[PDB]
A paper describes a structure:
The host factor [name], as the bacterial branch of the Sm family, is an RNA-binding protein involved in the post-transcriptional regulation of mRNA expression and turnover. [name] facilitates pairing between small regulatory RNAs (sRNAs) and their corresponding mRNA targets by binding both RNAs and bringing them into close proximity. [name] homologs self-assemble into homo-hexameric rings with at least two distinct surfaces that bind RNA. An [name] homolog has been identified in the phylogenetically deep-branching thermophile [name] (Aae), but little is known about the structure and function of [name] from basal bacterial lineages such as the Aquificae.
Upon co-crystallization with U6 RNA, a second, distinct Aae [name] crystal form was discovered. These crystals could be indexed in space group P6, with unit-cell parameters a = b = 66.19, c = 34.21 Å. The complex crystallized in 0.1 M sodium cacodylate, 5%(w/v) PEG 8000, 40%(v/v) MPD, and the denaturant compound Gnd was found to be an effective additive. The crystal structure of the Aae [name]·U6 RNA complex was refined to 1.50 Å resolution; we emphasize that the initial solution of this structure was achieved independently of the apo P1 form, via molecular replacement, using P. aeruginosa [name] as a search model. During refinement of this structure, two nucleotides of the U6 RNA molecule, including the flanking 5′ and 3′ phosphates (the latter coming from the third U), were readily discernible in mF o − DF c difference electron-density maps. Rather than being bound at the proximal site, the uridine residues of U6 occupied a cleft formed between the N-terminal α-helix and strand β2, in a position located roughly near the outer (‘lateral’) rim of the Aae [name] toroid. The Aae [name]·U6 structure reveals a lateral RNA-binding pocket that accommodates two uridine nucleotides. The N-terminal α-helix primarily contacts the phosphodiester and ribose groups, and the β2 strand interacts mostly with the uracil bases. Two side chains in the N-terminal α-helix of Aae [name], Asn11 and Arg14, contact the phosphodiester groups, and another cationic residue (Lys15) is 3.6 Å from the phosphodiester group linking the two uridines. Backbone and side-chain atoms from strand β2 hydrogen-bond to the bases, ensuring uridine specificity. RNA binding at the lateral site is composite in nature, involving not just residues of strand β2 and helix α1 of one [name] subunit, but also the N-terminal tail of an adjacent subunit in the ring.
Residue numbers in the entry:
A (entry chain A), B (entry chain A), C (entry chain A), D (entry chain A), E (entry chain A), F (entry chain A): 3 to 73
Write the structure that this text describes.
Amino acid sequence: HMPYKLQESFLNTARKKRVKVSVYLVNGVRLQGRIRSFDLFTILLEDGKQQTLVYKHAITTIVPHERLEIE
Amino acid sequence: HMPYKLQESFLNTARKKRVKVSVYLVNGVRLQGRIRSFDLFTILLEDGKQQTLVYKHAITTIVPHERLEIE
Amino acid sequence: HMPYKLQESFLNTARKKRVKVSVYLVNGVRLQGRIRSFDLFTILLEDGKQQTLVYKHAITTIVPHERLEIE
Amino acid sequence: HMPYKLQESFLNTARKKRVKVSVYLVNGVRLQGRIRSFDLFTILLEDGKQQTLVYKHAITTIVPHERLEIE
Amino acid sequence: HMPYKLQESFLNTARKKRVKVSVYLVNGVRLQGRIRSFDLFTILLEDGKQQTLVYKHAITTIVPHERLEIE
Amino acid sequence: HMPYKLQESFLNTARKKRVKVSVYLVNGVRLQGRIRSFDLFTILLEDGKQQTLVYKHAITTIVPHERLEIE
């Protein structure tokens, strides 16, 4: 009866499967790309050549463009 | 006289009973779906086929569409 | 010279005395109801039949509709 | 060379001296009253008969209506 | 290879050198004054006679009006 | 299988390589400069002569103007 690590499993599955995601921000901006890397407080998006470091505290939702079978 | 774990009991009861919820965000967006999973900082909503990872820091309120008898 | 637990005493007194409250949110929404339950990060409002889980991080102020003699 | 407890000394001095304050919120609302009580995360304002529990995370600034000689 | 205490050194240098600063808030308000005191979560601004306690969580940026040679 | 320190490696690589960055804030403001220094909660931007202390809690995204080969 231990809590599964939902956030880490979601982010790592999207990362490993190179699934494109939409990342929505508190101010209404929507980013798109792949999750190249993440850690406790940030996510590194990559879209083609561009890198964007996203602070999780600024994210409202992440919507994957393919269904994740969360590992 | 110990504090009951309100948040976890609310989320887990909604999850186990597959109760549809409305999740309101700080920016006025309202999401709807079932709570498939949650952890300390996030909630995984599911509406039919779509998955949405929601950061709790972006939520104002959660309103269940059926009364929860909180376990 | 120890700090009194103001937040917990306020919330628990409103809860035990079933005092109606107004809960104001960061986005200008005002909720009304009784505090049925609370924990470290959330408050369960009840208004007649409706339940609402409120995240404290989204609250600006709580105004009780009767004066609380804080226990 | 230890850090002085600025927040606690400011709040406690305003409280003990019953100095009226203006409390500004992140959404532009300005509250006025005396600090009757405070703890780690909240401040209890009182204006005549009305009580208001204010969450510190919603405050931008506190401006005292008399100069505080911070104790 | 230890991390330098940037925030504390910046704030303490501005304080000790009595450098006027601009403090910008999340809601677009700009405050001006000297940093008289600070602690983990707050900054005490002073402009002539007026005191203002500023919560760091409400600050976006601090811009010093003279270049700081950070100690 | 340990988590790489993404945020620190991103910030330190931008700092050491003196790469110009765009820092976007929760309120829509965009800052530009080099990361001269950072710590757990703040980033010191420098643009020519001007210094700006940025609180990370106010940042949504950081976009480097050159691709970082994150060290």
